[PDB]
Structures are given as C-alpha cells and as structure tokens.
Amino acid sequence: PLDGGRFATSDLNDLYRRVINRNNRLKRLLDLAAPDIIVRNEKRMLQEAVDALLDNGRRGRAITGSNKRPLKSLADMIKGKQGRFRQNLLGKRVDYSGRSVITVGPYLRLHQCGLPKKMALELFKPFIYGKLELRGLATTIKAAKKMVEREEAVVWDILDEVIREHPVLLNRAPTLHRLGIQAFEPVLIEGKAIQLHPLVCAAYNADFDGDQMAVHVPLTLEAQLEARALMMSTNNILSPANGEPIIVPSQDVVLGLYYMTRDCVNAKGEGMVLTGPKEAERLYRSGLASLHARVKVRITEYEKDANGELVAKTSLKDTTVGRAILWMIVPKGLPYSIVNQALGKKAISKMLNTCYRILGLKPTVIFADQIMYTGFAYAARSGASVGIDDMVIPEKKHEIISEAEAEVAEIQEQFQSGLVTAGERYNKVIDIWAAANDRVSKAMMDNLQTETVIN
Amino acid sequence: YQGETTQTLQDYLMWQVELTPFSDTDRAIATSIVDAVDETGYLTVPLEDILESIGDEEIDIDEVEAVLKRIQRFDPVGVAAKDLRDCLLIQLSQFDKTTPW
Amino acid sequence: TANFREGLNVLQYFISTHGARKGLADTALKTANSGYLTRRLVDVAQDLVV
Amino acid sequence: ERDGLFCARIFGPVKDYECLCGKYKRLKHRGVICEKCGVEVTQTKVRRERM
Amino acid sequence: VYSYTEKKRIRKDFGKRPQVLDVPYLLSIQLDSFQKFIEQDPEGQYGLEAAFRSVFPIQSYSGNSELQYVSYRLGEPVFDVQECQIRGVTYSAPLRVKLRLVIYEREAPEGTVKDIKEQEVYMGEIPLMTDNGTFVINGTERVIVSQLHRSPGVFFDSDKGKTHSSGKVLYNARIIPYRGSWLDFEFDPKDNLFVRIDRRRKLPATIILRALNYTTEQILDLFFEKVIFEIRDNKLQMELVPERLRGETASFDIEANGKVYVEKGRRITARHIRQLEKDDVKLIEVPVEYIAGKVVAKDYIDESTGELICAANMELSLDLLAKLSQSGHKRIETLFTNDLDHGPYISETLRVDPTNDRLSALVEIYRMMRPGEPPTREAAESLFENLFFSEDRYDLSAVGRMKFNRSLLREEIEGSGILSKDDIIDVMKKLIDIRNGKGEVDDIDHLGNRRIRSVGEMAENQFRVGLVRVERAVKERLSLGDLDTLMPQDMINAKPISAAVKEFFGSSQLSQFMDQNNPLSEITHKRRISALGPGGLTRERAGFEVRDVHPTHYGRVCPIETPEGPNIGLINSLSVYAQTNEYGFLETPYRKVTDGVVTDEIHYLSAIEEGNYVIAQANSNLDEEGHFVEDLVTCRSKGESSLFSRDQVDYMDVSTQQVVSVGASLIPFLEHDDANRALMGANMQRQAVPTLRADKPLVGTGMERAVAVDSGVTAVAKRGGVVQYVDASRIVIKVNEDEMYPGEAGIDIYNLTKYTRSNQNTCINQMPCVSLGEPVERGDVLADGPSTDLGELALGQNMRVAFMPWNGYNFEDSILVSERVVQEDRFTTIHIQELACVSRDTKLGPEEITADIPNVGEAALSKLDESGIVYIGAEVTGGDILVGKVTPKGETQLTPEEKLLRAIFGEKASDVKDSSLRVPNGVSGTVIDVQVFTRDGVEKDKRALEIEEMQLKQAKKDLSEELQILEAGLFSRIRAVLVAGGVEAEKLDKLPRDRWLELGLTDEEKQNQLEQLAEQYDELKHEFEKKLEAKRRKITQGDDLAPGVLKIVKVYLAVKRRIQPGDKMAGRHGNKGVISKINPIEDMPYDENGTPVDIVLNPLGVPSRMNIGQILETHLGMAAKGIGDKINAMLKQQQEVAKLREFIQRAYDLGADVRQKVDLSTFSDEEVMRLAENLRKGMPIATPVFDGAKEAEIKELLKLGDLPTSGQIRLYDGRTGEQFERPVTVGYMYMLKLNHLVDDKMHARSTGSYSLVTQQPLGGKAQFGGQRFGEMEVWALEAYGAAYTLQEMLTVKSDDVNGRTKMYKNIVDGNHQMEPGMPESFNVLLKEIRSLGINIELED
DNA sequence: CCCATACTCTT
DNA sequence: AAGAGTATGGGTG
C-alpha cells in the first residue's frame, strides 16, 4: 500500500497472473477447437510462463519489469545470500538489544562495563514494570507504563535495583572468534556512550576513534547463569587458540611501569638504606628521593613449600625506589626478582603468566587491575611528551650519502666505459644503496640509545 | 516486499488482558468481550450473547458482569461501554470528589 | 635519502604513494577472502563434539 | 475478488470471525460456513497457511 | 599591493619560490562543458547542433515529402534559481526548434518544390546550470560527476600466458567505436587468427575478408610476398635474393659462377650474405627436393588438357613438378615464409577456413549473429552492411578516428566515422607484425588512452537518444498521405525527449545530491572523476592494476585523495592546474627552457607529449636572469627520473603544488606526513560541521581565500563603489560613476541567506563583513558564508593542546576536553529539520486543515493559529501538534445512538477524525519557518496571504530604492532648469517637489524642456508601476501539485548541539579521536602563569603513525600565538602607532629570503590600527605544501615572541599542584568537529513492530528496530557452549509469536523462564518449498 | 577461477 | 574402438 490509494504489484503476483491468463486463454482455445498453429504457440507460451513462475532466468531469457529488472521467483525467495536460509534462519534481528559508540573507562573493574541509563531504561522495561507492581507503586499495568513514560524519580531507584546483578553481552563486529562477545556487569552512567575496560580492547580489536558496539540482555535464569559462568570477561583470561594471556597491558600502562622501574646514575636520594617499600613511597611523595635513585631496601618475600605453604624470608636488596614502590602490588608467593629490573611489555606478560600459573585466577584478576591503575598513574606523573628535537639525526649521515654517491658515479662511469653489463651495474648500485642505508641506521641507533651523565 | 505489524484497539485491549490476574474462565470471558468491541469502543452484543458463546452452563451472568466491570477500567477509560450513559458514568467515576459540578 | 623530520620533495612523495596505495588496496581486499576461508572451515567442522 | 488470488472463500476471512457478506460476525458462530459467501468464520491468520 | 579585503588582515607567508602562474578558476571543468553543450556552433561538432544535424533531414520511404531542421533557440526561464528552490521546481529553459516540411511532386526531374511550410515547435524543457556549476532539480542542488573511460579506437594487448598451461602469450587487437559494435581479432596456440563480433562465438579470420569481396589469391598477395621460380631447362634455375636466406641453413650445395659460396650442411651467415650482395649472385641451381613442401601462390592450368593443375595455397610435390614441367610452364609463384620471421598465419587460417566463396560467408555471419532462423541472402547482406558500414548504427567519432589513425602511423587526423577495408587490413597487418616480434602492446592504464567525459557530452548523448526515437515515430507517421494540411507541430511529440532529459538529470548514477557539509565538500564534489557509471567499470570486476598510481598521473590526478574501501583507486580528484584537451585528455602546464634559460612561456602538455621531453622539477634553484645554479638537475624523461645536464632540459614545473589536489594543498607540513595519514586527513577534512562562529586556521597554506571565493558561498561585489546601506540581511552598494551603464540607477542590492537548511540538515547563514560608508572594489568579499572568516576558509577552531598521558583518559585515541571549551560554545552546531503535512482529496470528501479538532483539549491547541498552523518561534517537543487536519468519515445512516451522540456532543465530532501532523517522539526544536503550497484554483488561507504579503514587501522595497534615486535626479534637473529663468530661490524650496511641476516659464525653450521633463517623469512612474505589477503577478501565481493533492504545509525546526563524550574530533593530519571526558577547569594542567590547556592528546599516537606534521603545526601555532600576545599587550596599554608598526614590520620581515614583501610605510595610521586589532589573537601564517617553513625559522619566530625554542614548557597538575617531571610540548592546533554525533548513534529497543511475512523485528533506528544476530555471533555462542542463550536469541526474541507474549508475561510476573516454540520463518520456508511442487513435511 | 560434460584428434 | 585434449556452461566469490 502506497500513499494516494495506489496498490502497485509484486513479482510473485505478476507471475501468477501471467500463468492464469495463459491457462484461461488455452482452455478457451481448446474448447472451441482452434487451428493447431495457434494452440501450439499458446502451449509454448504457457510452458514459458510456468518456467518463469518457478525459476525465472534459468531457461533462456528472464521476464523483466518496468525498470528492466528481472522478476523474483520462488527459487529467488529460497536460495542466495538474501534467501530464507542465510537471512532469516541462520541469523535474525532480535529484541532487547541496542548499540552506541564506545569510550574508555579507566576506573572500571575487569568485570564491569559502563551503560547509559537512557539505554538501560528502554532495555529493562518489563523488569521495571514488574518491580513497580510488586511494591505497590502501581496497581495496574497502565499505571506503571505511565509512570515509566513520565520518568519519575522512583523509577530510577527501581532501575538501579533491577540491574544490580544482571550481566549484559557486549559485541563488536566483525566477530572473528568467540572473544568478540563478552559478558559484563553494568554500571549506570550519564551520557550516551558505552564505557569499555581498557584491558579487553585487544580481545575486541577495538579502539576509541569511532567504533560502535551492540548490547544484549539475557532474560531467563539459564541465560544469566551461562553469561556469568561461561562468558564473563573474568573467565576469558587465556587464549583458546594458543593458551596465552589476552588481558596483557599495553601502551600507557607499559610506558608508566617501564618509567617507574628504571635507574639513574646520580639521582636525588641515592645511597640510603630503607626499612621497606612504605618508607620509599613516603620519601618519593615528599620530594626527598627520586624514583630512579639506587638504594638498599629490606624486602620480605614468600615462597610456597613442598606441601603448598607460604614460608617467608627477609633480606636487604639493592634496588630502586620505584621497584620497591611497585613491589607493594605483587601478591604473596612470587619472587622479588620479578620486579627488580626495567619492565617492558614482555616482562609484564611473563609476570602475569607466572602469577596465574602459581596462584590461580582471582589473584591474577586483582593483580591485573592493580597493574593497570599503577601504570596509568605513573604514566600521567612522568610527563612524557614528544617534540621535534627528540628525532636526533646522526652527524655522519651526509658523509655516508656522499660516499655512496661517489661509488655510484664511479661505477656508472665504469659501465659507460663498456666494462660491465646493465644488470650487473643495476645490482651493484642497489647493493651500494642497501649498505649505505644499513650504515645510516646503525649510526642513528647508536647515537639515540645512550647518554652522558655526571657521576 | 513486506509491511509492518500495527497495533489496533483490540490488540492493546488483549495486551492489557494478558497482564491482568484473571482465571481461565475469566480470561475466556474477557477474550469474548474484547472480541465483541467495535472501533468506537462500545459493546456491540448483549451479555447474553457472550454467556452463550462461552459454551458452558456452570457460569452465571454476574461473573460476566464482574469481568466486564474490570475490563471497562482499562486504557482508554470508558471502553466496552454498553451505551452512552454507561460510558459517561464510567468516565465520571474516575474523577475526584473535589470536582466542582 | 630523507626522513620525515627534514621533509620530502615532490618526487620522493610521489614515489612513496605507489607503495602506500598498494598496501591500502591489499588491506581493503584480503578481508573478503579471509571471510570465505573461515566460512568454509566452519562448514567442514561444524558437528565435531567431544 | 471471488475466485482470485486473494479470495476469502479459498484462503480465509480478512477479519477475525467475520464472513465476507456479514451475516455471522462473533465468536458464537465459530466454525460456521456461510451459505451466501462461502467464507468460514474463524481467525484471519489462516491466510498464512492455506494454499 | 593588497585589496581592501586582504589589507584588513594580511597572512605572513613563508614561501620562497616566486609564482609565475595563477591558480585558475576551480570550477572551469563544469562551466566550460555545459557552455559547449548549450552554445551556438556555426559548425556541427558540439552541442545540440551536432545532435540535430545527425538525425535531420528525415525522409519518408517514398520520398514525396520530408522534414528539415533549420535552427534552434532557448527561451528565458520562468523562475529564478532562488524562486525554484523556494517553490521546489526545476530551473530550466524551453527549447524552440524551427522545422520545415517540404513536399515533392512526381514524374519530374530531381525533386520539385511543390510546397514548403516552416514552423517553430516546442521540444521540451532543458535544465540550466547555475553560476556555481550546479543544477536545481525539484528544488534541490545536484552535481553531475565527470567520467574517466576508455578512448575509442584500436588497442593491441596480450594475455600473459595465463590462459594456456604452456606459458605462451596470445596477441589480440580490439576495435571499439564511440557508438556501434566491437570488433576483436585474436591469436590461438596454433597461430590461427580468429575474429569476434560483440563478444560472440569465435570465427575464422578469413570470413570477414571474404565478406569484403576478396579471393584467395588477393588475400595471399596482401598478406605474403611473392617468389618467382623459372624453369631454365636445367633443374629449376632460381634467382636468389641473399636476404631470403638469413637465419637459415643450406640443405644443398649452393654454387654460383663456378664458386660454391655455401656448401651442404653449412648455415648461411652474415658474411656470406654480404659476399653474395657484393657479387650480385642471382642464378642459383636448386634440386627438385627443394620444392618438396613449398606453397603455391596462384592457380595454374595446363594448355592441352585445359584443367586446373593445382589450386592456390597448396604444398607441392615431385609429381606436380613433373606435371608442370611437361605442360610448357616456365614461371612458378610461391610464398616466402619461415619460422623466425614472416611466419605463415594467414595461410593456415585459410586452410582451417571452410568457406571458399563470398555468398556463404555472409550466410555464416548471419547464422552466427542470429541463430535459429533460416539464412537469407538479402537479410545477411543487409546485416553485414549495417554492422560496420552504416552511419546510422556505427560511429567512429573524431577522437576515435584520431586515435585509430595515430595507432597505425597514418598522417591524416580527420576522416570518416565508419570502417573501411583499408582499416581492417591495416589492423590485421599491425597485429601480425606484433606477433612476429616488431612493435609493442599498449598500456591500458596510460592516461593517453583514458578520456574525460563531462556533463555536456552526456547530455548531448541523451538528447540524441531521445531524438532518434522521435525520428522513428515521425517516419512511421509520415507514410500516410495528408500533406496538404499537415503541420510539423502535429507530426512530432515532445514527450520522449523531455522524459529522457528528466531521467538523465534526475535518476542517473553520476547525478547526485551535492555534498553540502562545507565549501570544501562542494569544491571536491564538483572536481570528482569516476571510473564507474554507464560505460565504465564495476567495483566487483576492476583489478589491482586499474587501482594503482600510474606515472602519467603526475600533475593530472592527485595521488593522495581517494576513498578507502571498495572504491579505492576508482574515484579520483583533479589536480590544481589540470585541464582537458579538445579531445578530452588531461594536460598540465610547464615552463619552456630555451638555451639553458627558464622563460615565462607556458605550454600545456598531455601524457603522450610529456614522455618525449626532459622536464625539471620546480625545486630547482635559479639565478636572477634565469639560469640553473647547478649543472646536474633532477628530471623525469620517460617515466623515470635521474640527473641531467643543464643544456638537456626542455621544460620545468610551474609550482610545487602541481601534483596535489585542492584538499591536499590545504594540509600544512604535508611533506612531513606519511601518505596513508595524509589520505585519511584529506578524507576527513571535508566532513567538518560549521560552528556558531568561524575561526581562521592561524596556520595555513595560502589556499584558503581561493577555496572560499570560488565556492560561491560568499557575496562578492559585482562592481565597485561605496556601501550605501548595510544590515544583517541585505547590503546596498552605490556604484561608481565610471562603472555605470547609461540610463540606469547605479546601485547593487545583495539579499543574504539566513538560517537555511542544507542537504545534510545543517545551517546555511551569511553575515556581512563591511561597515557603512566604506569603499569596495570588484571582487571584494561583502559577506561571509558558512565556515568562512573575512573571505578565508575556516573549518574548525584553534585549540591550546598538550601532548601527555592523563590517567588513561587518552588511551587508544581518546581525547580529553576542558570544560571551558564547552562553556564558550566553540564546537556548538545548528541543525535544521523539515516536516511536511499533505492534505489530499478523497471520495468521502476533501481533507481539511483546521484548528477545530473535536477530540483534543484546549491546551493542546494553544500553539496553533487561527488557520491550524503553529506559530513562528514556538518551542515544541515530541507529541506536539504542528498542523491540524481532519479526514471525512461521514455516513448516510444515522442510528439512534449516533443521533444521541450528535445531539449531545455536536455534529462536527461525528463527521471527521483527527489526522494531524505531530512532532516525532524524540525530536525537539524551535519553529523558524513555515511554507504553504496551494493548488491553483483553491482558496488561500490567512497564513498563505501573510506569507505572500511578506514576499511582496521586499520587492516593493527594492523598487522604491531604485525609484528614489531616479526621481531625485529628475527633480534635480527640473530645479536646475527652473533656476535658469524665473528663479524663485527660497520660495522654490518652501513648496514641495510636486508643486515645482505646477509652474510655467516663458514661451522660449524653457517650457518645452519642462514639458519633456514632465513626460519623462510620467514614463518613469508608469514603468515602475508595471514592474511592481509583474512582480506581484509572479508572487501570487498558484502551485502545480501532484494529482489528488490539495495543500502542502512545510515546517522547519532548528536545534543546537553541544559537544559531549562520544563525539568525534580530528585534525588535518589524520589524527582522529573520540571525546572521553569533559574535565573541570581546575583539574587541567597549567603553566607558571596559571593558564590551563584546552585539549590533552596522547603522545603515543605520533611515532607509529609517522604523521610528524602535527608537532610542527603545534610549534608554529605556539609562535603565532606568541606574536599575537605581544600585539595584544601592546594594544591594551595605549602606545604610539609608531611602536606598533615597528613591531609588526619586524614580524613581517622575518624569514630567510621569502618572496612576500610587506611595507607598512604606505599604510595610514587608521589602517595600521585596524590591522593590529585584527592581529591581537594571533598572526596567521601560510606554509605551502612543499615550500613551507623550516625549523630554524620556527625557532626564530619563537624567539621573537619570547618563547622557549624547544617548544616545551613546564606544567603543573591541577589536582595536586605538583610539577610534572619532564617538559611537555604545548601549543595550538586546528581541530575539527566531524559529522559523527553520538546523538545520531545511540539506539535501544525492548519490543516493537515486526515484519508481516517473517514476523521478525525490523532494522534501523528510524524504524525503532533491533540489532542483527548473525552467523558469526551464533558461531561464537556455539564455541562458548551457551545453548540456552542461543535458543532464547533464536525463538522468544525474534519470531516465536506465542513465545514472545508468554516471555513478556513471565518477566512481568517475576518468573524468568521461557517456553520455546517453532520459528515462523521455518513455516514460511516449508510453504515456499511446497509451492515448488515438492512434498516436505514434519514427521512423528 | 575452478570444475563437469560434450565434441574432436590420435594410437 | 577407446582415450586424451579443448571448448562451453555452471557455480562461487
């Protein structure tokens, strides 16, 4: 039905009408005993019409419409990427779903997500209706419906009560593996964007420059328990492809942890003996000691026994202030040597894997959250920036280029003398340029990686 | 091509009937009553027709009256009224006594 | 022979555009074949259960 | 239209429990075949499953 | 010397290379093409004249009468562009064509002129192009994109041995006309030539040769060389050419003159050939075995027997030699073929060819073209004749003919549009030569083989397509004899032509809605080149090669700006200086170098011409007199670059921006950015949304003014003069005396565009930038459009930015934004939405637009006027009524209950029902405009009359403004005449001006002059009255609505969007991100003076992306802001003008040999103060894309402003006051707000409506639909093992009709349990399969 | 691009 | 008389 009373037509109805017209004409002609030269043509046209109705285009030409588009037949309804199987039976659109743009939540825990309350009000509407009717605020369904439509002050308390422990499913397309859908506990937030934990983005292959995500709500008890026990992000710590951790820190966290665990030759507060990590933190926050100063700290560490009991040992360690500060985050059962170095991405991943293999699942989750928090805090505190003067050019670059150009010129003159072939000259020039590039790279990297300090 | 489903008055009334604590007999009576409602909101048959359409002799007319009274308070108020006077009185019964006239 | 700090001239930038566009086109195209491969792999092992 | 691609006598009523001419209209006449138009008095969703 | 607009704020330029060629008008490609289509051509090569001359004269079958075309003409449009946009109609002109019907008698020499009748007829409407290169179709601006296609002609190619498994290449040739059928020749692994027509069944190559009336002997003579053997009574004595034996080996003893030059088993070398040529060795004795396999050329017969000894193209034998030896024959003709060269291909094609005549070849061609029908001689002959030799079905156009002749080394450029025997023979010979090993194949991606087709050519093609159908209809109708009274008007119908023109201009693939985000979007859209469209390629079948950057793209196609995705490499942008030939090939300008001196001569070269010269780069140093400083300059010669001497250079580039497009030329420090990020930045730059207040970049390239002016979004002075009147909506300029035409009032009026909706639902608003009484010149900017600031493009805002991590809030391209940015509305945008209400006519009665709706309360009708339409300026939200409408529902039967209802509640309630227009849920705004369209013949309501009165007032105002000047001049003349004779002095001015007319002078010429003045005054008044009446008639004209439509009401709502988390921001270097948090002012990092930053960006995103231009831009913006701060501090404490101009002169003089020269000694004190006032928020700077500023100059400018050279300062934490441990890069960057707003993205659904057939939720936010759970999500759930979640997703959430209701009831009851059933789509599938005649059923 | 089937040259 | 090779048509993306 279209505006103005016009009803138009459909392809299937058109094909049926053509078949019916041909059949009626053939019946009338056979009843009157028409000459065979006409009835044979009518029978051929009826056969063509039936063929078009069943599978249009398979036999010779295809019957088209006004816009020269072939009509869709029953086979077109059944098969193809737009057919029943692939569009309506293997996948479908569902209720209780939404989508929006994603931002970063740096404060969240690993099992939590940030959901706008405008989305949550629509998503959990029948739950809110039931809860309103349960505690006497509404006596009928229409009263609760009107109360929710007005968005009164008590419906927000009801919504906060109904979503307290009820996981939701977050999904980002394309879903390449089963880690593309994960379950989270919602936290109601203001705004219109979904907040995502930084440590799950690698599993989603997501970044915060325009990506959108979809959200689904489990309804039955079985679905909620499956979401909690099978699909929660706190259960998806290891990779099903190779068994390695997938919640490893990256970028800012790595930069902060690396910055706080480096040492400097002559830093403020160097050479003092401390009673423990807390004294180191007090000295750093008071401005009395540097993060990179090399000191001696009393450290107590625990190791699991043969039967699995933690036995403690205390000793003086030569370390830095930042390593002692970071040691307060490590759980009991790990050696102190796991932090007494400059920690890069691989070191942090190995530390997380060691924690998971030795202690289990829950300490690993707590450790990962603490690592992310500390990395963000100290990356912010460092003040790391990028400037044009950071890209230092080696001073020998022009000399190397001039030497390569001189070699190219001399070999070109040698070729012009007729001593070598064209391909040999081409290969020699390429080799000369490759050697010059390697020399320039080595000089630049040798200049960049070291600095001079006063003892 | 395909269109979309539309909600009519009877669809809304049956949606409200679904979420109302009726019994099976009351639910069947409500189904018949909603079936007997036109697009202006008035009842088109006497309650005798509904009682006969229920199909059992264990049900009296006062149960049908009670179910009809419960239905008449659905949204919109005054729906399934017997006549104009009934609709006006049902609409008035939802007003507070502080109304001047 | 130049880096991004000192800047390129017209000819060097025009030369680099070839590789840039080739890489972008390959990235834009290969996903369609990757999807077909994973569809076939899912089709062949759909019903294998422990 | 009668005997057409949307005929109510073949495929079913276009309204719930109402025949085409309009003699039988309510649930008390369910399962009745009208002698004037030939339309059964039943649900209009049977037009999804009658060939 | 600077213009008035530019002298208000001069941008400092760091360019160092002088410009010898101005940037051309950026929309020439559209305007020139349409002008060529529309203009009058004395010849018949372009436009409508060419199409008319290609169809007319039309002659009947008998020839007793005919139609001829004389000339055409275009009438004036009924409405203007603005009027068409308001009324929603098409801006077009009528076509008036003069035809002449001539009648011929019978039984007379030649054709007697019995009667000639000439008539001018109407051929329909032709849309016109505006001044900005657009078309207004149905009240909307549209753009037609140019097409890049393959040029007509002949092309030689070869598959690279991929088809065959032996690694052998197969050469082929293809002939493609502009209009006709393709003709393909190809080789096979058996070295047999074959021919294809219209990509159909393969045929032997000799079928076409025989169809051209050729015999085997003639074909052999054409494609081979003759060898003559003479029987000199002794073993076939032979005359030998030495060159014949090259590369072969002697099979016998070759001796001559008693000397054996070559022995048996010895191959023939070059020395032997030279010796034979020196000795002129002709006579050679050969054995009989030497003729054991030679091919005979012609047919031989025996005189005695009279039979045929042998047929042509046959191998010989000893018995045949014996037969011819005894038959008295002394001359034998053979063919010269071998293996290395001159390979036999035509002979083998003849051998495989079954035909041996001329009539059967036509039969076979007819059978190949049309199978399943008996062959007819006449039918086959006509088919072959019309296939390639008919001017009515085959056309090899002028460009096609030129390419065809050039590809065969011809000399004539012009020729005929049809093929000939010579053309096909030459193509065959060229392909054979390619196969032998001499010559090369063509490069399809070379820009000398690809052609540009613009809107005018496509319009001409469509017009001819309509015209041929019209001609066919006329020829059909002209057979009947009624010529004594027939007229050309009755003979033709103008419907097919108008239909074709409308279809092309409205529904073509290359006709699109104009991109109207900003001026740069429109400029980019109008300069777009597409390889798709009718006659182009498809994205599904393109290939890698066609998507690559070709060396010939240099200066013609931008190698950077292209979409990323499926269409990569298929959509291109024109370069800045690129043009087209007369044939449609892209060309670029170069400077000619004469005797080592670079001159100012400019030559435009195409891709073919460019490859034959050595061309130097624009980055080459020159002396004062124009000499290369060095002696080894870098140049490109033949698709490759290397060093050349100073005297080997022929041409030089004209500019350093000759390679990039307009969008890429607007990126500063482009040479420091990677190409991928440059592409991303160019793509994102043209989707920025204009803000409330424009802000110039403060770090630019120098191309902002050209983009701002050439886009047409601003108001530009047509003539110079003085600003007589200025206002927020109109500007009146008093034109200079010497720029005025005789007899006119010298004023120009500009009405500005105020708060108008664009195609992307944004705001179009113009604001004046001139003051009362100031001088203007032709070309100056009078008013700024959207995203324009004092005549410069202004797409974003200047932001104070720092590069540091901040507690994880800029993790993975997140952006932290200060609250001060939000409080100042620096990224707030205006969005305008349109709603429509249509009142139609029904059978029960017409619908009525009224304010009296019976079933709604008084409060809900409070915002409607007396006509039932909302007021201007009302604040509305979802559910409010905009237009009140009722629909009839009356019936002729009144039941007692209906009578009671009518008696108690009135008759109006029982007759009509509400059908009003309401605000959609989730929409809010302010009513800013209402339009009413009424069908001609229907009475107008109060609102329409008010609108028409408002429209009439403005025209009255303009006409009065002109009349005042004219009548003041006339009355000044009257007073001057009165003074000279009979002067009354003060008494004259005591009386009003009209009383001056009621005076008389002496009987001399004074009275005659007074009468003349009075007559002129009366004529002027009459003329202006006529003008006003015509304007009123145009305003009050009725509307032409769709059938059954009574009235239409359109309402416009305006809303303001603020910045919030989830909005997308970007720079110009490909650095995009999403806002994550709005931070309070005291939490931001700040410097020693307590000044916070606006934005915090992550430094981790710079090194891996290699877009270093943003860091340099930040440093330069810091320096510019420092200069501005110096100027502002100098202005705050009132100081002398001398100190200000001294400091500003120091600022402008900075640099290392810059071409710009600014002298403030020619500025007045007022001009200096105005310039200083415009510079107090930062000095704008320009850096061209390859001639920009160096780091040393940036450090010098930082020093001038008393700023650190490193570009880094110390910051303090807002929350604690503690200093950060390392210096931080802090500066200014130009940021843009993109059109991906989170308000348009967020969507959620609990339940809603479903499809009627599948019973599944709909899709889309507009339909309140749900999200799709596809196959991959199902796979993920299966891999988890969550069976209940999958089943719940599959049944009770999508299409289990009873399950949905039961689940909803259970959830409301607090019982979380489902009762799954059968999906309805499976039942639909079962019914569909049963409808195919297959019995499928469920069992048990 | 890759595979299945009908038609043609060869041992 | 079989058997290997080539051309054509169907399906997928």
Ligand SMILES: [Mg+2]
């Ligand atoms: Mg992204």
Ligand SMILES: [Zn+2]
């Ligand atoms: Zn009936």
